[PDB]
Every structure is written in C-alpha cells, then in structure tokens.
Amino acid sequence: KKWFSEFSIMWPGQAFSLKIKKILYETKSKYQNVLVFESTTYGKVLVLDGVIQLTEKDEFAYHEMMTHVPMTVSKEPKNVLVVGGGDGGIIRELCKYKSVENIDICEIDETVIEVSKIYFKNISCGYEDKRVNVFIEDASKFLENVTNTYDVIIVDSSDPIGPAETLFNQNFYEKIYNALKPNGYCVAQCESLWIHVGTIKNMIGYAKKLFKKVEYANISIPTYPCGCIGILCCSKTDTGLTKPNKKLESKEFADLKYYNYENHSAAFKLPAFLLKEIENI
Amino acid sequence: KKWFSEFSIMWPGQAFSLKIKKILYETKSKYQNVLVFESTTYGKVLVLDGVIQLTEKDEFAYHEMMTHVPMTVSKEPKNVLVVGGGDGGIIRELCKYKSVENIDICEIDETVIEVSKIYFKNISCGYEDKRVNVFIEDASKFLENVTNTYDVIIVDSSDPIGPAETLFNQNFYEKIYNALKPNGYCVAQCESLWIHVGTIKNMIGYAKKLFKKVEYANISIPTYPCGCIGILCCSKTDTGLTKPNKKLESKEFADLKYYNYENHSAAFKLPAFLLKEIENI
Numbered sequence: 001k002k003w004f005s006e007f008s009i010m011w012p013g014q015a016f017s018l019k020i021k022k023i024l025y026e027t028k029s030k031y032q033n034v035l036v037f038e039s040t041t042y043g044k045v046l047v048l049d050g051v052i053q054l055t056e057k058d059e060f061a062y063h064e065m066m067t068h069v070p071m072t073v074s075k076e077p078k079n080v081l082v083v084g085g086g087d088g089g090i091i092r093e094l095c096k097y098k099s100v101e102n103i104d105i106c107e108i109d110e111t112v113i114e115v116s117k118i119y120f121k122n123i124s125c126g127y128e129d130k131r132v133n134v135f136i137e138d139a140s141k142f143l144e145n146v147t148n149t150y151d152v153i154i155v156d157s158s159d160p161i162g163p164a165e166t167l168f169n170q171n172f173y174e175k176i177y178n179a180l181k182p183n184g185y186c187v188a189q190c191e192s193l194w195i196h197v198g199t200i201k202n203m204i205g206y207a208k209k210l211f212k213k214v215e216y217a218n219i220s221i222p223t224y225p226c227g228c229i230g231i232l233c234c235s236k237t238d239t240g241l242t243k244p245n246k247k248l249e250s251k252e253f254a255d256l257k258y259y260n261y262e263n264h265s266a267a268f269k270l271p272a273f274l275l276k277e278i279e280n281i
Numbered sequence: 282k283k284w285f286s287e288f289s290i291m292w293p294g295q296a297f298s299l300k301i302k303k304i305l306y307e308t309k310s311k312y313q314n315v316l317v318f319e320s321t322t323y324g325k326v327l328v329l330d331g332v333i334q335l336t337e338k339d340e341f342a343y344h345e346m347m348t349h350v351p352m353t354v355s356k357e358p359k360n361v362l363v364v365g366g367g368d369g370g371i372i373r374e375l376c377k378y379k380s381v382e383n384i385d386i387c388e389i390d391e392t393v394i395e396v397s398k399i400y401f402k403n404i405s406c407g408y409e410d411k412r413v414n415v416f417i418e419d420a421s422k423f424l425e426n427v428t429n430t431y432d433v434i435i436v437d438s439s440d441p442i443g444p445a446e447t448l449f450n451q452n453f454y455e456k457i458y459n460a461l462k463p464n465g466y467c468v469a470q471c472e473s474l475w476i477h478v479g480t481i482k483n484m485i486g487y488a489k490k491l492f493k494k495v496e497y498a499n500i501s502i503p504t505y506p507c508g509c510i511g512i513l514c515c516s517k518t519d520t521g522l523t524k525p526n527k528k529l530e531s532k533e534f535a536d537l538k539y540y541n542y543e544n545h546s547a548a549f550k551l552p553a554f555l556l557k558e559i560e561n562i
C-alpha cells in the first residue's frame with residue numbers, strides 16, 4: 001500500500017501522511033486538483049491541491065464547532081450563508097436547526113459539490129434539504145452582489161494559497177460586515193495557532209477594523225496541519241461568541257460527536273503565547 | 282535534505298514527518314534507540330525507538346500543562362516525584378516553585394539524561410538545582426521500594442510499547458496511590474483521544490479502583506500523534522484537579538508560554554464522543 005503525504009509552503013519542514021487503501025477519484029477542475037481516496041484508518045479523504053480538506057474519521061470536529069458556535073449564540077437565525085463548504089459538512093449541521101428558513105451556499109468549484117454527493121453521501125446529505133440554495137461563484141464576487149443580509153455567515157474556506165486567496169483580506173471582511181444583519185455573526189476558518197500566527201494577527205486586524213468584538217477559538221482535529229485549526233469569530237455586539245444562548249437538546253442534535261455546551265466556551269481559552277501575540281492588535 | 286518519519290503500530294495508517302537540517306547523535310542504549318537531530322522548523326528533536334519524545338518548538342505545551350495542573354492544585358507541595366522525564370522538561374517547570382524542598386526523578390535510561398544535558402541545555406537546566414535527586418531505575422521497581430511519600434507524582438512516561446510497558450497497569454497505580462500523601466495527586470501521560478480511547482478507558486478504570494476522583498485533560502501539541510496528548514488526573518479527594526488554587530504570578534513564571542489560570546480548567550472540557558465512551562467505567 002502507498003501513502004498520501006501532505007506538503008505545503010504554508011507549513012514548511014513538516015508533513016502528515018495517511019496510508020492509502022485505494023484511490024477512488026482524481027481530476028483537475030477549473031480551479032484545483034481533486035483527489036479522493038479511501039485511507040486505511042481515517043475512512044474516505046478529500047484532497048484539494050495536495051491539501052487534506054476532510055476525512056470521515058474527524059470532520060465532525062471542525063463542522064460541529066464551526067456551525068454550532070455561532071448558531072447557539074444567534075437568537076433566532078433565519079437566513080444563513082456558507083462561504084466555500086462545497087463538501088456539505090456545514091450544511092449538514094445547519095439543517096439540524098428547524099428555525100432556519102434559508103441556507104445559501106456559495107462554493108467556487110461545482111466539482112467539489114458533485115464529488116461530495118458521489119463519494120461522501122453522509123457529509124453531503126444536506127443538499128437534499130429544500131431550504132438549501134446553491135451558488136457556484138467566487139464568494140468575493142457573490143458578497144459584492146448579494147441583496148439579502150444574513151443572521152450568520154460561516155466562512156468554510158481552504159487556505160490563503162489557492163482559490164481562497166480572495167477571502168483573506170480587508171475588503172472581504174467589509175463585504176461580510178455589510179452582508180450581515182445589525183446583530184449578525186461571522187465565523188471563519190483561521191488556521192493553526194502553532195504555525196500561522198502572522199496570518200491570525202492579520203485576520204484579527206482586518207476584523208477589528210469593522211467588528212466590535214473579535215475572538216479566536218481552537219478546534220482539535222488530527223488531519224489539519226499541527227492537529228488543530230482556529231475559528232475567527234466576529235460580532236457586531238459586544239457580548240461576542242464565547243457563551244451559547246441555547247442548549248442543543250432536540251432529537252436532531254442527539255448525534256453530536258464533538259460540540260457541547262461546555263466545550264463551546266472552552267475553545268476560546270487560548271495558550272499563553274497566542275494571547276501575548278494578539279494583545280496589541 | 283532528508284526527512285524523519287514517525288511510524289508506530291500504536292498509530293497505524295498515519296505518520297508525521299519533520300525535515301532534517303542535520304543529525305546530531307545516534308546510539309542504542311541499554312533500553313532503546315536514541316536519535317537527536319536539528320529539524321528545519323521545529324528546532325532540536327529527541328527520538329526514542331522511532332517515536333518523537335520532544336521538540337524545542339512545542340515541548341513547553343506538554344511540560345507546562347503536566348506540571349502546573351497538579352502544582353497549582355496541591356496546596357503546599359514539598360516533595361515531588363517525576364517518573365520518566367529524563368529530558369528534564371518537568372524538572373525545569375518544578376524548579377520554578379520556591380516552596381518545593383525535594384524533587385526525585387526516576388528515569389530508567391541514564392543515556393536520555395546525559396543526551397539532554399549535552400544537546401538540550403534549555404530543557405535540562407533543572408538538573409543543576411540542588412533539590413533534584415536522580416534515580417536510574419525502572420519506576421515500577423522504584424515505587425515498590427520508596428520509603429517516602431510524595432505530595433505530587435508526575436508520570437512523564439513514553440508509550441505502553443517499550444520500557445514504559447510496566448507503567449500502564451493496575452499494579453502500577455496501586456504503587457502510585459501508596460507512594461502519595463493522603464491528599465496527594467498524580468498526573469500521568471495518557472495518550473491521544475483521537476486514536477487511543479481503548480487505552481484511555483483502561484487507564485481510567487485502573488485509577489478509579491483506588492482514586493476517588495479521576496479526570497482527563499487534553500493538551501494541544503503538534504508533534505505528538507494526532508496533535509494532542511492527554512493527562513490522566515488522579516485525586517484522593519473529591520475536589521479533583523480541574524480548578525487551580527493559586528495564580529502563578531512570581532517572576533519565575535513570567536516566562537510561561539502555554540499554561541494559564543483559565544486554560545487549566547479548559548483542558549478538562551472534552552469532546553462529546555470521549556465523554557460518552559468513558560461514562561460507564
């Protein structure tokens with residue numbers, strides 16, 4: 001059996017590898033190289049431009065924290081935007097909320113959606129929900145043109161090198177701010193505290209120019225570089241996103257594997273070195 | 282430049298790799314294969330039997346959490362035992378406490394100590410402290426023969442495959458219980474929640490047979506498998522180890538890079554799936 005190895009200039013001098021049971025699908029889409037394989041111990045794996053996007057074994061950690069942090073704080077979220085997220089993980093978690101009336105998703109690469117529907121049925125199941133509306137477009141452009149405002153925006157993007165380049169700048173955060181309701185919230189994929197402090201500082205700086213409360217949370221997930229990835233958390237009120245307003249007690253949430261009421265707040269308790277780096281932004 | 286890759290049957294189907302700037306030292310000791318190299322991005326790395334023991338870039342996460350969790354809960358710790366810990370990381374953190382009167386360390390492999398003194402001077406600096414007493418012995422035997430009792434025991438061991446095999450059983454926890462003061466605490470290296478739930482359940486079961494309060498905490502550290510490692514936390518009172526009794530405010534602690542008052546308690550807030558697995562032990 002051969003091994004898949006994840007290299008990037010975004011994490012120089014380190015690599016994570018997974019043993020390949022079998023390769024399932026490969027293509028070059030309009031935007032990126034796509035690889036799907038069954039790993040020996042992590043289930044099926046989606047790879048975009050050589051970077052692990054998700055695995056079956058651990059995706060719930062990232063999808064549950066990204067979704068349930070803002071969705072338990074927002075009082076009565078009706079309209080939600082997912083930026084990126086073609087795999088459907090975020091949408092799957094959002095559909096658990098009966099109060100949600102509309103879920104828009106803006107994914108740049110339609111190939112990702114169709115690959116997820118074929119190879120990852122338990123992740124992409126949310127596309128069958130009638131509330132879900134799909135837009136195939138660079139979210140940077142979508143957000144410039146949208147007429148609606150949202151209660152929650154979830155930026156489920158890949159890394160700043162690649163198609164997600166347009167999502168890691170000041171202008172993007174202006175577009176997010178404007179596309180949110182006066183009491184709206186945004187959470188965004190915001191990299192690893194172990195290797196990406198420069199990016200984290202930059203992103204916090206962008207968010208603070210517009211949002212009155214900007215916070216950072218950490219998620220444990222073994223198949224992202226350094227075994228963790230952060231959530232940049234953006235609020236227009238000053239109460240912020242650290243404290244949930246509701247408990248997820250209905251039958252739809254009985255299946256949760258990572259998120260709970262207590263670890264919501266725990267995720268925001270950061271290592272000393274990180275607090276020091278971000279204090280004067 | 283070549284790469285070092287970490288394989289083990291303890292984590293099948295996955296591997297973490299570090300690019301090698303230069304190899305510094307290799308030997309087969311009485312107990313294990315020893316490798317020291319300068320990595321390109323993680324500083325110097327100590328490898329025992331092909332398993333990463335520490336790197337300069339991140340060791341503070343594990344050494345600070347392992348030490349300061351029990352040491353901020355124990356009221357006036359005077360006598361502390363470190364089991365394993367030849368590298369000196371735990372001892373370095375313990376020496377910051379002026380109230381400590383004695384630190385015993387029982388390391389099986391004297392080669393590890395001497396390698397750390399040569400190649401890792403900023404980790405092994407605690408050996409110069411006059412309170413430190415070194416024992417070269419299997420801790421399983423040391424703990425059977427010791428006459429003293431301790432306020433805190435820190436089990437800084439490697440994995441159950443290898444010399445640390447004697448430290449992952451019921452009899453060992455009996456020896457720990459007996460070697461502790463009536464209000465003593467023990468913390469022990471207890472593997473990754475992402476891949477080692479069987480071991481975690483077993484270890485909790487062993488501890489619960491003797492300790493009235495058994496708790497589990499998680500540490501983010503990129504160079505241990507799955508990017509995290511747990512602390513098994515053992516108390517003879519029922520108050521447990523989740524809440525520190527003191528703040529580390531003196532000049533000796535100004536340098537802390539991970540541990541703080543808030544993340545002490547946060548470390549014990551575990552993912553939903555783990556809580557479910559351990560609930561009926």
Ligand SMILES: NC/C=C(\CCCCCN)SC[C@H]1O[C@@H](n2cnc3c(N)ncnc32)[C@H](O)[C@@H]1O
Binds near residue numbers: 083
């Ligand atoms: N749910 C795990 C997925 C991600 C998280 C992976 C994190 C990786 C950590 N190393 S990335 C999700 C999506 O972001 C999409 N995307 C990238 N750029 C844009 C854009 N400009 N507009 C819209 N969608 C975009 C990608 O095509 C990808 O399908």
Ligand SMILES: NC/C=C(\CCCCCN)SC[C@H]1O[C@@H](n2cnc3c(N)ncnc32)[C@H](O)[C@@H]1O
Binds near residue numbers: 364388421438506
């Ligand atoms: N501080 C990071 C170190 C460790 C943590 C590494 C975790 C690795 C995660 N994969 S292991 C520390 C020590 O435990 C010692 N040791 C192993 N078995 C025994 C024993 N029976 N008695 C005494 N000492 C022992 C090893 O020789 C090693 O030097």
